[PDB]
Amino acid sequence: AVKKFKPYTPSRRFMTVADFSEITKTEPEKSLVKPLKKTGGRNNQGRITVRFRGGGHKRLYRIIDFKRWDKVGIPAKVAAIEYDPNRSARIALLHYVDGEKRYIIAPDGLQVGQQVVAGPDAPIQVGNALPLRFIPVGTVVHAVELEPKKGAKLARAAGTSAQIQGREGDYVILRLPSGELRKVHGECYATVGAVGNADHKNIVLGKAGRSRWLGRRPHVRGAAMNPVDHPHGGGEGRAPRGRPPASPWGWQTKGLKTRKRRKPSSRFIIARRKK
Amino acid sequence: MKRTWQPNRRKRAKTHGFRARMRTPGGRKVLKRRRQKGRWRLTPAVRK
RNA sequence: CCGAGGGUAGGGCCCGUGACUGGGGCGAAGUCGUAACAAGGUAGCUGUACCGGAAGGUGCGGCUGGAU
RNA sequence: UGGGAGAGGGUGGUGGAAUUCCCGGAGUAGCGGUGAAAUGCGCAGAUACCGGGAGGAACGCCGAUGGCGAAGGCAGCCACCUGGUCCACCCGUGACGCUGAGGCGCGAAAGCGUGGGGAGCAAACCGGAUUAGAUACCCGGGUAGUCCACGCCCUAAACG
RNA sequence: CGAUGUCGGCUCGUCGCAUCCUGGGGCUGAAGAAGGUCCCAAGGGUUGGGCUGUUCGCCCAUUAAAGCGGCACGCGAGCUG
RNA sequence: GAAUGCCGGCAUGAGUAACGAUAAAGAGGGUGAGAAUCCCUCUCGCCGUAAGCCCAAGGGUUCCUACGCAAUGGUCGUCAGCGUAGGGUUAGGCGGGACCUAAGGUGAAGCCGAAAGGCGUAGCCGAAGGGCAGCCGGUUAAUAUUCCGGCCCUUCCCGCAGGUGCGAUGGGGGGACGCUCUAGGCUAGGGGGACCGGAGCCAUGGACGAGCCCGGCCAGAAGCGCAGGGUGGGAGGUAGGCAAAUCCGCCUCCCAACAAGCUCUGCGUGGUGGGGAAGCCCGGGUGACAACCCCCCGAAGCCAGGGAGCCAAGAAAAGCCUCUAAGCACAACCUGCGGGAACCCGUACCGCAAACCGACACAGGUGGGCGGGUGCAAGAGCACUCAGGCGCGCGGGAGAACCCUCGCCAAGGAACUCUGCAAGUUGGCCCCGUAACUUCGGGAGAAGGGGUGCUCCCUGGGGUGAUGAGCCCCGGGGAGCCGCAGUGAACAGGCUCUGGCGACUGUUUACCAAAAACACAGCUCUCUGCGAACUCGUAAGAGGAGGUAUAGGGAGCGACGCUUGCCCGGUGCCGGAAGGUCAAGGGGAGGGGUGCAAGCCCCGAACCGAAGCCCCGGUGAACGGCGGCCGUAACUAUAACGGUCCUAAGGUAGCGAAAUUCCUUGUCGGGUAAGUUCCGACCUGCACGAAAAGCGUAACGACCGGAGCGCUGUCUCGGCGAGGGACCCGGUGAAAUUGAACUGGCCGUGAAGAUGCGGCCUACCCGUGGCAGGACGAAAAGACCCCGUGGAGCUUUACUGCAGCC
RNA sequence: GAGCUAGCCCUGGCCAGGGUGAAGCUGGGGUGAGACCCAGUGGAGGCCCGAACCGGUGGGGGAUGCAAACCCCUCGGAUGA
Ligand SMILES: O=C(CCCC[PH](c1ccccc1)(c1ccccc1)c1ccccc1)N[C@H](CO)[C@H](O)c1ccc([N+](=O)[O-])cc1
Ligand SMILES: [Mg+2]
Ligand SMILES: [Mg+2]
Ligand SMILES: [Mg+2]
Ligand SMILES: [Mg+2]
Ligand SMILES: [Mg+2]
Ligand SMILES: [Mg+2]
Ligand SMILES: [Mg+2]
Ligand SMILES: [Mg+2]
Ligand SMILES: [Mg+2]
Ligand SMILES: [Mg+2]
Ligand SMILES: [Mg+2]
Ligand SMILES: [Mg+2]
Ligand SMILES: [Mg+2]
Ligand SMILES: [Mg+2]
Ligand SMILES: [Mg+2]
Ligand SMILES: [Mg+2]
Ligand SMILES: [Mg+2]
Ligand SMILES: [Mg+2]
Ligand SMILES: [Mg+2]
Ligand SMILES: [Mg+2]
Ligand SMILES: [Mg+2]
Ligand SMILES: [Mg+2]
Ligand SMILES: [Mg+2]
Ligand SMILES: [Mg+2]
Ligand SMILES: [Mg+2]
Ligand SMILES: [Mg+2]
Ligand SMILES: [Mg+2]
Ligand SMILES: [Mg+2]
Ligand SMILES: [Mg+2]
Ligand SMILES: [Mg+2]
Ligand SMILES: [Mg+2]
Ligand SMILES: [Mg+2]
Ligand SMILES: [Mg+2]
Ligand SMILES: [Mg+2]
Ligand SMILES: [Mg+2]
Ligand SMILES: [Mg+2]
Ligand SMILES: [Mg+2]
Ligand SMILES: [Mg+2]
Ligand SMILES: [Mg+2]
Ligand SMILES: [Mg+2]
Ligand SMILES: [Mg+2]
Ligand SMILES: [Mg+2]
Ligand SMILES: [Mg+2]
Ligand SMILES: [Mg+2]
Ligand SMILES: [Mg+2]
Ligand SMILES: [Mg+2]
Ligand SMILES: [Mg+2]
Ligand SMILES: [Mg+2]
Ligand SMILES: [Mg+2]
Ligand SMILES: [Mg+2]
Ligand SMILES: [Mg+2]
Ligand SMILES: [Mg+2]
Ligand SMILES: [Mg+2]
Ligand SMILES: [Mg+2]
Ligand SMILES: [Mg+2]
Ligand SMILES: [Mg+2]
Ligand SMILES: [Mg+2]
Ligand SMILES: [Mg+2]
Ligand SMILES: [Mg+2]
Ligand SMILES: [Mg+2]
Ligand SMILES: [Mg+2]
Ligand SMILES: [Mg+2]
Ligand SMILES: [Mg+2]
Ligand SMILES: [Mg+2]
Ligand SMILES: [Mg+2]
Ligand SMILES: [Mg+2]
Ligand SMILES: [Mg+2]
Ligand SMILES: [Mg+2]
Ligand SMILES: [Mg+2]
Ligand SMILES: [Mg+2]
Ligand SMILES: [Mg+2]
Ligand SMILES: [Mg+2]
Ligand SMILES: [Mg+2]
Ligand SMILES: [Mg+2]
Ligand SMILES: [Mg+2]
Ligand SMILES: [Mg+2]
Ligand SMILES: [Mg+2]
Ligand SMILES: [Mg+2]
Ligand SMILES: [Mg+2]
Ligand SMILES: [Mg+2]
Ligand SMILES: [Mg+2]
Ligand SMILES: [Mg+2]
Ligand SMILES: [Mg+2]
Ligand SMILES: [Mg+2]
Ligand SMILES: [Mg+2]
Ligand SMILES: [Mg+2]
Ligand SMILES: [Mg+2]
Ligand SMILES: [Mg+2]
Ligand SMILES: [Mg+2]
Ligand SMILES: [Mg+2]
Ligand SMILES: [Mg+2]
Ligand SMILES: [Mg+2]
Ligand SMILES: [Mg+2]
Ligand SMILES: [Mg+2]
Ligand SMILES: [Mg+2]
Ligand SMILES: [Mg+2]
Ligand SMILES: [Mg+2]
Ligand SMILES: [Mg+2]
Ligand SMILES: [Mg+2]
Ligand SMILES: [Mg+2]
Ligand SMILES: [Mg+2]
Ligand SMILES: [Mg+2]
Ligand SMILES: [Mg+2]
Ligand SMILES: [Mg+2]
Ligand SMILES: [Mg+2]
Ligand SMILES: [Mg+2]
Ligand SMILES: [Mg+2]
Ligand SMILES: [Mg+2]
Ligand SMILES: [Mg+2]
Ligand SMILES: [Mg+2]
Ligand SMILES: [Mg+2]
Ligand SMILES: [Mg+2]
Ligand SMILES: [Mg+2]
Ligand SMILES: [Mg+2]
Ligand SMILES: [Mg+2]
Ligand SMILES: [Mg+2]
Ligand SMILES: [Mg+2]
Ligand SMILES: [Mg+2]
Ligand SMILES: [Mg+2]
Ligand SMILES: [Mg+2]
Ligand SMILES: [Mg+2]
Ligand SMILES: [Mg+2]
Ligand SMILES: [Mg+2]
Ligand SMILES: [Mg+2]
Ligand SMILES: [Mg+2]
Ligand SMILES: [Mg+2]
Ligand SMILES: [Mg+2]
Ligand SMILES: [Mg+2]
Ligand SMILES: [Mg+2]
Ligand SMILES: [Mg+2]
Ligand SMILES: [Mg+2]
Ligand SMILES: [Mg+2]
Ligand SMILES: [Mg+2]
Ligand SMILES: [Mg+2]
Ligand SMILES: [Mg+2]
Ligand SMILES: [Mg+2]
Ligand SMILES: [Mg+2]
Ligand SMILES: [Mg+2]
Ligand SMILES: [Mg+2]
Ligand SMILES: [Mg+2]
Ligand SMILES: [Mg+2]
Ligand SMILES: [Mg+2]
Ligand SMILES: [Mg+2]
Ligand SMILES: [Mg+2]
Ligand SMILES: [Mg+2]
Ligand SMILES: [Mg+2]
Ligand SMILES: [Mg+2]
Ligand SMILES: [Mg+2]
Ligand SMILES: [Mg+2]
Ligand SMILES: [Mg+2]
Ligand SMILES: [Mg+2]
Ligand SMILES: [Mg+2]
Ligand SMILES: [Mg+2]
Ligand SMILES: [Mg+2]
Ligand SMILES: [Mg+2]
Ligand SMILES: [Mg+2]
Ligand SMILES: [Mg+2]
Ligand SMILES: [Mg+2]
Ligand SMILES: [Mg+2]
Ligand SMILES: [Mg+2]
Ligand SMILES: [Mg+2]
Ligand SMILES: [Mg+2]
Ligand SMILES: [Mg+2]
Ligand SMILES: [Mg+2]
Ligand SMILES: [Mg+2]
Ligand SMILES: [Mg+2]
Ligand SMILES: [Mg+2]
Ligand SMILES: [Mg+2]
Ligand SMILES: [Mg+2]
Ligand SMILES: [Mg+2]
Ligand SMILES: [Mg+2]
Ligand SMILES: [Mg+2]
Ligand SMILES: [Mg+2]
Ligand SMILES: [Mg+2]
Ligand SMILES: [Mg+2]
Ligand SMILES: [Mg+2]
Ligand SMILES: [Mg+2]
Ligand SMILES: [Mg+2]
Ligand SMILES: [Mg+2]
Ligand SMILES: [Mg+2]
Ligand SMILES: [Mg+2]
Ligand SMILES: [Mg+2]
Ligand SMILES: [Mg+2]
Ligand SMILES: [Mg+2]
Ligand SMILES: [Mg+2]
Ligand SMILES: [Mg+2]
Ligand SMILES: [Mg+2]
Ligand SMILES: [Mg+2]
Ligand SMILES: [Mg+2]
Ligand SMILES: [Mg+2]
Ligand SMILES: [Mg+2]
Ligand SMILES: [Mg+2]
Ligand SMILES: [Mg+2]
Ligand SMILES: [Mg+2]
Ligand SMILES: [Mg+2]
Ligand SMILES: [Mg+2]
Ligand SMILES: [Mg+2]
Ligand SMILES: [Mg+2]
Ligand SMILES: [Mg+2]
Ligand SMILES: [Mg+2]
Ligand SMILES: [Mg+2]
Ligand SMILES: [Mg+2]
Ligand SMILES: [Mg+2]
Ligand SMILES: [Mg+2]
Ligand SMILES: [Mg+2]
Ligand SMILES: [Mg+2]
Ligand SMILES: [Mg+2]
Ligand SMILES: [Mg+2]
Ligand SMILES: [Mg+2]
Ligand SMILES: [Mg+2]
Ligand SMILES: [Mg+2]
Ligand SMILES: [Mg+2]
Ligand SMILES: [Mg+2]
Ligand SMILES: [Mg+2]
Ligand SMILES: [Mg+2]
Ligand SMILES: [Mg+2]
Ligand SMILES: [Mg+2]
Ligand SMILES: [Mg+2]
Ligand SMILES: [Mg+2]
Ligand SMILES: [Mg+2]
Ligand SMILES: [Mg+2]
Ligand SMILES: [Mg+2]
Ligand SMILES: [Mg+2]
Ligand SMILES: [Mg+2]
Ligand SMILES: [Mg+2]
Ligand SMILES: [Mg+2]
Ligand SMILES: [Mg+2]
Ligand SMILES: [Mg+2]
Ligand SMILES: [Mg+2]
Ligand SMILES: [Mg+2]
Ligand SMILES: [Mg+2]
Ligand SMILES: [Mg+2]
Ligand SMILES: [Mg+2]
Ligand SMILES: [Mg+2]
Ligand SMILES: [Mg+2]
Ligand SMILES: [Mg+2]
Ligand SMILES: [Mg+2]
Ligand SMILES: [Mg+2]
Ligand SMILES: [Mg+2]
Ligand SMILES: [Mg+2]
Ligand SMILES: [Mg+2]
Ligand SMILES: [Mg+2]
Ligand SMILES: [Mg+2]
Ligand SMILES: [Mg+2]
Ligand SMILES: [Mg+2]
Ligand SMILES: [Mg+2]
Ligand SMILES: [Mg+2]
Ligand SMILES: [Mg+2]
Ligand SMILES: [Mg+2]
Ligand SMILES: [Mg+2]
Ligand SMILES: [Mg+2]
Ligand SMILES: [Mg+2]
Ligand SMILES: [Mg+2]
């Protein structure tokens, strides 16, 4: 579950923390961490291109195995489950009978000391990876590639999962976490099960300081600015929007579809998302 | 209170120095113009 | 030393009262409708929820203390 | 000790019919709805027919004046975990019992919180009729909710 | 308009009299006492509070009386703001 | 002769303001032409978590010494951070380079751009981070971890001896990490000693004393001791660590394991080298053959890469160890020892300031370390004071008004005023005690009160010792003493009741606004399937993100509680393969120019022909909107009810004279002797209302209202006192302003407010301290207002383009 | 031109002292087992008081200033955005 606090400060009243109970190792593997270059939202020109970024806790980036068809047939023991600051899910440390060590994102139900494997012949069990054209229709799955050998792209966030809905030619039909129905090539790898740490979404940040620890600087409404800054700027006293609600750059932000209409992906997208 | 000039020799050499001017076209013109005018010092003096 | 009591300060309970406000009872010589008693003209009653000038309605479940 | 019946409860799985939606075919002038209608849907190809897919809820015949539970209540099918109850043997214990203010637990529906889910249904709501009027009954829509997990609520014509 | 600072208050006054009081008068529907009204008169006097930024005004308690106006709606090189 | 003209010169204000912290001065003696100001002595005062000491920036000779005083120095000057001259900065170990990387910068390959140029993995550069070997004392006028002394150490080269499969820019280990809390043992620093050393002192009534005053240490290789840090050993298998690998990783087996051992560090001791006070005497000598010991306190520093807990999950690369490849195995490397070798730059002095940033020797600003003692609960607070440093570069008088900063005040006590503005009161610690309401944390230091010094006596536990003495620490119970007063001085909340707004901590208009504004957790809508959307860029490339719908972007709303109604006709957005309109292009009935002709050239209807717009539908936590008239009930009054106009639909819950109410000080109630404010109500709401959210809400607020208690010079209503000015004398000596002036009152006149015109009145000449009514006083070519076919920012269904998108 | 200022990036450093006493853990009570209750321990927090440090609330002074934003008194934050 998620952990509550007694209200001994104004902010501890609603603040809630992850219970951190599936974790067995509190230190990262040294050969698998590299420094994460903080950007602040700035680009190679030095310009802010994503607003209100920066000042978050320092982090080392843990290298994650998003291929796994790397080591077809070679099993590995689940040695430990770790915290990872660079993603919502937890990471599992794998010990291969090869001797090689690697990281995957922990599916829900992984056990320390469990054996997992990856390949066309792999058992359909939580933690194993297979090409999609071998996972039985119906089973939920995660860490799905979008194209063969290009890396796991779908269902990598905490609690997320995709389900296989059928097969058509060289393609399987997936229901992504958004509800979109998508053709994905049958030779794209995936890992049977759902991503763990599903209680992530019930966390209550609790105070402005917690947002800041995460590298999220305070966001400022256009309505609180001036006409030089935002379409919603100016006005005497408070003001309604007085125009279709817009972004800082003028485009409308209530309903306007923005996917590129002629994108070739459309041939493979069965049904736009829900909700 | 704290004023605008807070001297710093590395900041002075790396900002206005000769090598900084020679990199940029606008910097080479600054030197061309100061040499045309007959300036005694083409760049600020920094002690290193 | 204790000490009637007086003094300062903070509490607890009760009683009288208060602009105004809530429903209740009774009065009957009114206005609106007709909710219930006949299958009372939508069987009724019911806990609850939402709603409507009003009696009331409807949903969900329950009872027969329901006519044929 | 031995045996029996049962929708008693809890958990995880799985089966088929049907409704709705979407994809393909084929086909055209209405369909739907009512006491009669209209709103509604339909030449932007509906309804009726065939194939495929998706999803949720409830389990037809068996089913009955039936069965089970302390009550609320429990109904497709498989398994696991588990309660109560009856019978025959008359073997063990030797009044160890009855009740029960307080207490604790359970407690239909509706309602509440957090998060899923959402096909059908349907408060509120919108429209059509009915009518003297019709904030209703009847018709076309339709959101909570009804469903699942966890925590509250603790009511009833909770009745025999 | 190459600037004459604008409401109210405080302080400091000074002047006019169409006089609020005190002084002197005529008439009264002036018995007395107390008033009404008009004339003469500017020497002095003309309170303390509650409300509001207020000027004003209402109100409390008094008073012989609680006057009204001018001085750049007197006075920011005097203060307040 | 005027341009608030330009440059320069010199006046006026004026012997006026001022001479830069109110920390403070006096005298004696010297020097000298000249002395409040320079040097010396004595007395006084100020700083002492500095106003003392060290370091990094920045400054650049300001350092030392001699000789000087024109200018600089707010006066003076014989002095100086000033003038002239001479001297002064010494390193293998301290800092930087001949080492490593961080962001960033540059950039073989490579990519992009009219040119200039933009990017870019590796590499290179880049430090106050990593790494790396020096401590104490002495010496100079001036440098010292640099010279000297004592004791240590590092690297490179060569040689010798031993040992080993040696060898790397390649593989691996390591380097290597957060915040809060914290153990043990140390050291830095400190207090005490009746003990050790010491020049001396006996005052003024007493004291020859367990007297007074002074000091009682610093470094130190190997070894040893104490405390820690780090590290398991063996064998077999091996398909992984872009080759190899005996290394590392993985699996299994066996002794070992909170041990030891091995290794490293800190502290102690340590051969040895140093230092060494007060006082007296002229920085030096003496004290002195100085003593150099014990007890107590004890770090935030050290052992250290220690321990624990927590979530926000906490650099890199080289040095180093290991592994092997080419190679090489007479070499090569490792260990010990020896001899040789060891370069470049900095080093003065200032450094919280008179030497840096502020035009000034400027009350401002400036990063790190040390920062003693006593007392007050603690402490870096406060008072005093050590070492050390100062008395602030004009003085002497006087004792006015007035100003400033401060002290007191009879009786009253907010009567002051826009407001208790300001100033009082309160004040630390210990104990007793403490309300509504509440999200159960709080509100709370609630409120309110009692205690507080010193003396004696009895006594409980702790630390260090040893279990004792001593030292130090936390208490208890008695009995007394003094004063007006015991946190006796300094530092240290006034409190309560009740509304508005915002949940809260935060943030903001550098330099007139700190708030109710911004942000904020949280709520909802919406976009985005990843070469994501979106953002920056012509592009390449980037951010997003080494993220993947429990994610990222945009918007509104803003803890939490209870909630969030009706209108989709207009605008927006979403969906809609039909229809209507639609450009280039396709098409070519037909028509034209020309030539004698084949031919060449032009126009050109039907029909075909995208998006968009029209059209159908959806959509409000999208832009937004949410009525009017007549009539009706046993008296009046009102209208549950009916009728009728209009609309896309006529404001629901809640709230309401409100941060909204014009009329308005609505009416009534409460508080007051009196209440335009405040609180509670009513509702004809000029002109609330539901995420530009509605109504509430404990806690919070240097926010804004209303009331009270306490206490006050706020006031009645003022008085006195203090210091710094104001004044007088000596020294230095500005400023805005200034047509020129020989510059009076009244009643008038005058461009309508006259020192300057008329009449009359008044008036001897010139200053000093004072006050501010006038000189439409000074300052700023009015910010308001208008005007100019003047400008700029912003807006849109103004016009016309452009990017971007289709 | 970011040696002032604003934001971010890399790498360092600073925050006396005192007060409150969350989770957890241990013991006891409690039950069929629990919830939970008490005590000791513990040491949480955009927690409390208050120096450094960062500020700039109210008032007074200053106004050709010590200062082209200063001074005094008072006041806000002070393990955190
Ligand atoms: O305009 C002004 C003087 C306005 C000065 C206000 P200011 C100031 C300037 C100098 C000296 C004193 C005060 C100021 C105003 C603007 C800019 C700078 C300074 C100020 C200072 C503080 C607070 C408020 C104002 N007088 C004009 C004559 O030209 C005239 O008499 C006048 C016309 C119309 C009204 N009228 O009531 O309409 C009032 C007065
Ligand atoms: Mg909580
Ligand atoms: Mg807690
Ligand atoms: Mg809890
Ligand atoms: Mg709170
Ligand atoms: Mg936890
Ligand atoms: Mg976990
Ligand atoms: Mg879990
Ligand atoms: Mg770590
Ligand atoms: Mg690394
Ligand atoms: Mg990275
Ligand atoms: Mg990065
Ligand atoms: Mg770059
Ligand atoms: Mg650039
Ligand atoms: Mg962006
Ligand atoms: Mg940013
Ligand atoms: Mg994680
Ligand atoms: Mg999580
Ligand atoms: Mg959340
Ligand atoms: Mg973070
Ligand atoms: Mg946000
Ligand atoms: Mg915002
Ligand atoms: Mg604004
Ligand atoms: Mg701008
Ligand atoms: Mg614009
Ligand atoms: Mg704009
Ligand atoms: Mg606007
Ligand atoms: Mg507006
Ligand atoms: Mg606005
Ligand atoms: Mg407005
Ligand atoms: Mg605004
Ligand atoms: Mg606004
Ligand atoms: Mg606002
Ligand atoms: Mg709006
Ligand atoms: Mg607007
Ligand atoms: Mg609008
Ligand atoms: Mg694709
Ligand atoms: Mg300057
Ligand atoms: Mg600086
Ligand atoms: Mg300089
Ligand atoms: Mg520098
Ligand atoms: Mg530097
Ligand atoms: Mg620099
Ligand atoms: Mg340069
Ligand atoms: Mg020259
Ligand atoms: Mg130059
Ligand atoms: Mg008595
Ligand atoms: Mg009836
Ligand atoms: Mg009926
Ligand atoms: Mg009605
Ligand atoms: Mg209804
Ligand atoms: Mg029943
Ligand atoms: Mg009946
Ligand atoms: Mg579905
Ligand atoms: Mg049946
Ligand atoms: Mg039955
Ligand atoms: Mg028997
Ligand atoms: Mg129930
Ligand atoms: Mg639905
Ligand atoms: Mg009607
Ligand atoms: Mg609802
Ligand atoms: Mg709901
Ligand atoms: Mg329900
Ligand atoms: Mg029954
Ligand atoms: Mg004017
Ligand atoms: Mg002028
Ligand atoms: Mg008479
Ligand atoms: Mg009479
Ligand atoms: Mg008369
Ligand atoms: Mg007469
Ligand atoms: Mg008179
Ligand atoms: Mg007179
Ligand atoms: Mg008035
Ligand atoms: Mg009288
Ligand atoms: Mg007047
Ligand atoms: Mg005037
Ligand atoms: Mg007038
Ligand atoms: Mg007037
Ligand atoms: Mg006036
Ligand atoms: Mg005036
Ligand atoms: Mg003024
Ligand atoms: Mg005035
Ligand atoms: Mg004046
Ligand atoms: Mg004047
Ligand atoms: Mg005033
Ligand atoms: Mg004002
Ligand atoms: Mg002329
Ligand atoms: Mg002039
Ligand atoms: Mg001139
Ligand atoms: Mg000139
Ligand atoms: Mg002259
Ligand atoms: Mg003068
Ligand atoms: Mg001066
Ligand atoms: Mg002198
Ligand atoms: Mg002299
Ligand atoms: Mg001297
Ligand atoms: Mg001290
Ligand atoms: Mg200089
Ligand atoms: Mg020197
Ligand atoms: Mg010199
Ligand atoms: Mg001189
Ligand atoms: Mg001289
Ligand atoms: Mg001079
Ligand atoms: Mg001089
Ligand atoms: Mg000077
Ligand atoms: Mg001389
Ligand atoms: Mg000097
Ligand atoms: Mg010399
Ligand atoms: Mg040396
Ligand atoms: Mg070299
Ligand atoms: Mg390098
Ligand atoms: Mg370095
Ligand atoms: Mg070194
Ligand atoms: Mg040494
Ligand atoms: Mg020297
Ligand atoms: Mg080797
Ligand atoms: Mg690391
Ligand atoms: Mg580090
Ligand atoms: Mg911290
Ligand atoms: Mg001590
Ligand atoms: Mg003694
Ligand atoms: Mg020891
Ligand atoms: Mg191997
Ligand atoms: Mg000596
Ligand atoms: Mg001797
Ligand atoms: Mg001797
Ligand atoms: Mg500390
Ligand atoms: Mg550690
Ligand atoms: Mg976390
Ligand atoms: Mg790196
Ligand atoms: Mg070979
Ligand atoms: Mg060896
Ligand atoms: Mg060299
Ligand atoms: Mg030196
Ligand atoms: Mg200072
Ligand atoms: Mg300092
Ligand atoms: Mg200046
Ligand atoms: Mg000076
Ligand atoms: Mg200074
Ligand atoms: Mg010391
Ligand atoms: Mg004290
Ligand atoms: Mg104290
Ligand atoms: Mg202090
Ligand atoms: Mg002392
Ligand atoms: Mg002085
Ligand atoms: Mg005098
Ligand atoms: Mg003073
Ligand atoms: Mg006295
Ligand atoms: Mg008094
Ligand atoms: Mg009083
Ligand atoms: Mg009193
Ligand atoms: Mg007040
Ligand atoms: Mg109370
Ligand atoms: Mg409570
Ligand atoms: Mg609290
Ligand atoms: Mg108290
Ligand atoms: Mg209170
Ligand atoms: Mg005493
Ligand atoms: Mg003091
Ligand atoms: Mg005090
Ligand atoms: Mg206080
Ligand atoms: Mg209160
Ligand atoms: Mg509010
Ligand atoms: Mg605010
Ligand atoms: Mg606030
Ligand atoms: Mg709130
Ligand atoms: Mg806030
Ligand atoms: Mg400001
Ligand atoms: Mg400003
Ligand atoms: Mg300014
Ligand atoms: Mg400004
Ligand atoms: Mg402000
Ligand atoms: Mg504030
Ligand atoms: Mg703001
Ligand atoms: Mg805000
Ligand atoms: Mg909310
Ligand atoms: Mg762009
Ligand atoms: Mg790129
Ligand atoms: Mg990227
Ligand atoms: Mg990236
Ligand atoms: Mg992402
Ligand atoms: Mg908020
Ligand atoms: Mg906000
Ligand atoms: Mg509540
Ligand atoms: Mg609409
Ligand atoms: Mg519309
Ligand atoms: Mg409609
Ligand atoms: Mg519009
Ligand atoms: Mg058709
Ligand atoms: Mg033709
Ligand atoms: Mg022709
Ligand atoms: Mg709405
Ligand atoms: Mg809504
Ligand atoms: Mg409209
Ligand atoms: Mg709107
Ligand atoms: Mg009537
Ligand atoms: Mg209205
Ligand atoms: Mg409504
Ligand atoms: Mg009202
Ligand atoms: Mg009123
Ligand atoms: Mg209101
Ligand atoms: Mg209004
Ligand atoms: Mg009005
Ligand atoms: Mg009003
Ligand atoms: Mg008004
Ligand atoms: Mg009135
Ligand atoms: Mg008021
Ligand atoms: Mg009214
Ligand atoms: Mg808004
Ligand atoms: Mg508003
Ligand atoms: Mg709204
Ligand atoms: Mg606040
Ligand atoms: Mg505030
Ligand atoms: Mg006074
Ligand atoms: Mg005195
Ligand atoms: Mg004086
Ligand atoms: Mg005096
Ligand atoms: Mg003349
Ligand atoms: Mg006049
Ligand atoms: Mg005149
Ligand atoms: Mg005259
Ligand atoms: Mg004349
Ligand atoms: Mg004349
Ligand atoms: Mg004449
Ligand atoms: Mg004349
Ligand atoms: Mg005269
Ligand atoms: Mg004057
Ligand atoms: Mg004047
Ligand atoms: Mg004049
Ligand atoms: Mg004037
Ligand atoms: Mg001016
Ligand atoms: Mg001009
Ligand atoms: Mg003008
Ligand atoms: Mg003008
Ligand atoms: Mg005008
Ligand atoms: Mg025009
Ligand atoms: Mg014109
Ligand atoms: Mg313009
Ligand atoms: Mg776009
Ligand atoms: Mg760092
Ligand atoms: Mg701190
Ligand atoms: Mg405790
Ligand atoms: Mg624990
Ligand atoms: Mg804080
Ligand atoms: Mg705090
Ligand atoms: Mg605090
Ligand atoms: Mg201030
Ligand atoms: Mg004050
Ligand atoms: Mg004062
Ligand atoms: Mg100051
Ligand atoms: Mg101060
Ligand atoms: Mg704070
Ligand atoms: Mg504080
Ligand atoms: Mg603190």
- The angstrom resolution of this structure is 2.8
Rounded to 10 degrees, the C-alpha dihedral A52/A54/A57/A58 comes to 150
Distance between Cα A50 and ligand 237 center (Å): 51
Rounded distance between C-alpha atoms, residue A16 and residue A211, angstroms: 13
Rounded distance between C-alpha atoms, residue A92 and residue A114, angstroms: 11
Q: Alpha helices of B1-48 — where are they, by DSSP H?
A: 9-16, 18-23, 25-36
As beta bridge partners, residue A163 has A140, A175
Sign of CA dihedral A173, A177, A180, A184: negative
Distance between alpha carbon A125 and the CA centroid of its chain, in Å?
22
Distance between Cα B5 and ligand 138 center (Å): 24
Rg (CA), chain A: 22
What is residue A225's three-state secondary structure?
coil
Rounded distance between C-alpha atoms, residue A182 and residue A150, angstroms: 17
* B window 17-46: Cβ near strand G (< 7 A): 44
Rounded distance between C-alpha atoms, residue A84 and residue A61, angstroms: 8
Q: Which residues contact A224 (CB under 8 A, 6 or more apart)?
A: none
Identify the helix (H) or strand (E) that includes residue A173.
Answer: strand A171-175
Closest CA to A22 of A64, A61, A78: A78
Rounded distance between C-alpha atoms, residue A90 and residue A105, angstroms: 6
A139 contact to strand G (CB, 7 A limit): no
Q: What are phi and psi of B14, to 5 degrees?
A: -75, -15
Specify the experimental method. Answer: X-ray
Distance between Cα A11 and ligand 244 center (Å): 12
Answer for the pair A258, A272: CB distance below 8 angstroms, yes or no: no
Q: What letter does residue A246 receive in the DSSP assignment?
A: B
Tell the residue number behind the tokens 């809630």, with chain if given. Answer: A16
